[PDB]
Design a protein around this ligand. Structure first.
Ligand code: PPY
Ligand code: PPY
Lengths: 326, 326
């Protein structure tokens, strides 16, 4: 009858804690009696407790500015019995805090994890603060005393007796981390019985593929399979297999559920070629902004030709030579 | 007549400082009068000074455990006039240090950047140390006083009056970061005149490609071009174009120089399709370990069939259903 435990990277107040709160909200219907959010010291302990069946884990997956959390990716790849079934986002915003009762004019020190101080340079500038490092942004907000300002997640203001003096004060606008919720596979299959039965098309999957061949053409031959099946991808990365340099796996995120016939037929083809395959996550399809190509702002330099009216002798232009280095 | 300046992420003692030392050695023949290694506060300042023509920059590129340094990747993508021309590695090993004259039995505190303490857990355990955070591992070794042990790069022992008591004491064996050396493009083209003239095949390139089309098949059609040209890839990642979600660029690392005819003909084809393209780096080809496929150790679970003798009704095996979630 107990609350479903949701294990996240501690301590209390981290962005991963916020992710757990968000997850508990979106997943409320799966666990009517609610969730018990439990901080853990690290990610391997989270996976272990999830895989033992004590509850669900939530782990940072991808940030749009910093990329994948590669150790988490690698750990999920090699888990014996976990799969992702929800993907939740947390905007990376830092608030500024003082110890309750402390006067902000008297703060001379900014405290946060060094990566947090790096994201709040302007604020530190504008307030003439020195910097002191903390083990985490959250620990900084926990340990606040007068004469300091801590930078941390919005959630810290809920958890500790601290006074918010600044909201979303970080330099960069628009960074966000996505997190996956993880559970043993049989449990998830059951949770997915209805959409699987309804052949619901509104799902995304994350898949790892290892063609057991090397050399030119291996990835092209693989991806032709997804093309010919009409499967759209939204993220792709190559990784070594278990840190071994010179080995190659591929992790794809696609706009399909593995029960869809086109997906099924792709995987049959890939598996019958001998490639190793594993589905790492299946979760409801997020709605992607689709800014049109004609509105895409391209990076500086580079070569771009008008495909319907090509320039003459374009291959020898000095600027082309520079950008392509040929 | 001066030393060539080499700008790296400060302060003195960082792994990036070690990378600069390594770079100065491998590149000694380009600058007979030697190098002046200059620490800078951040990467954008490094790129700026490189692009202004004050000297060369060196920036962290990819770590095998943590992946690409995505902000560095993105910054190079958008530079107006920089290209990489050397790729140097630094093994991630931490040494343990005490203030000169201090007795190691009396150390009660370990100091490092939190990511450094996280990589040296066992040592901290085995020595009954509490932990204190520092802004960087290097800063920890700089600021050493008795009763502390700092964890930092080998180079710290050269730069500060500190006594090494432990060598490569970190938990994980075998992590390494590669760094790129950057310079304006005309300068690099000149540096590459000989191998370009000799049509030297012993180079690798990093390339960013942006097909100006969306939907299924876009990447497959692109990569078919590299297949048909016999170009082998060793790394691949998708990225948003300038943080914009729903836009897509691709960054490939390949075993060819852009002057090679097969490479040239690939890029002609890609450019005449309308895709935007930019070469981010060209540098001597590193020798890749090529462990044979039959020796590849695969991750736990997953589906792998014997391609020459397939199992019967394999698509309905309970274990298959679990690993693929269909
Ligand atoms: O080819 C497709 O499926 C596309 O949508 C392009 C793509 C491919 C892989 C990652 C991101 C975008
Ligand atoms: O298809 C090839 O070129 C391969 O070598 C496989 C591959 C592709 C992309 C990144 C790493 C390996």
């Amino acid at each position: 009858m107990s609350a479903r435990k949701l294990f996240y990277l501690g301590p209390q107040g981290t962005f991963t804690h916020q992710a757990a709160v968000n997850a508990a909200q979106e997943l409320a219907r799966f666990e009517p009696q609610g969730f018990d959010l439990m901080p853990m010291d690290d990610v391997p302990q989270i996976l272990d407790a999830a895989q033992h069946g004590d509850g669900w884990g939530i782990v940072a997956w991808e940030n749009n500015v910093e990329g994948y959390v590669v150790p988490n990716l690698d750990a999920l790849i090699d888990a014996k019995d976990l799969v992702g079934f929800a993907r939740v986002g947390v905007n990376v915003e830092f608030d500024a805090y003082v110890a309750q009762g402390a006067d902000p004019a008297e703060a001379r020190i900014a405290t946060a994890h060094p990566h947090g101080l790096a994201q709040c340079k302007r604020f530190i500038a504008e307030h003439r603060l020195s910097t002191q490092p903390a083990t985490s942004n959250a620990a900084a907000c926990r340990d606040l005393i007068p004469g300091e300002i801590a930078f941390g997640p919005a959630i810290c203001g809920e958890l500790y007796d601290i006074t918010r003096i600044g909201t979303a004060i970080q330099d960069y606008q628009g960074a966000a981390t996505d997190f996956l919720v993880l559970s043993p596979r049989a449990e998830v299959a059951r949770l997915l019985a209805k959409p699987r039965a309804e052949a619901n098309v509104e799902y995304e999957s994350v898949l790892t593929l290892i063609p057991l061949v090397t050399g030119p053409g291996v990835l092209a031959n693989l991806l032709d399979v997804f093309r010919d099946a009409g499967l759209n991808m939204t993220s792709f990365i190559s990784r070594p297999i278990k840190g071994r340099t010179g080995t190659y796996s591929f992790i794809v995120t696609l706009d399909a559920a593995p029960w869809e016939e086109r997906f099924r037929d792709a995987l049959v083809e890939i598996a019958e070629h001998g490639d190793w395959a594993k589905t790492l996550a299946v979760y409801p399809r997020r709605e992607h902004p689709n800014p049109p190509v004609t509105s895409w702002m391209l990076p500086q330099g580079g070569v771009r030709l008008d495909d319907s009216h090509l320039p003459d002798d374009w291959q020898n232009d000095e600027t082309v030579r520079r950008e392509l280095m040929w």
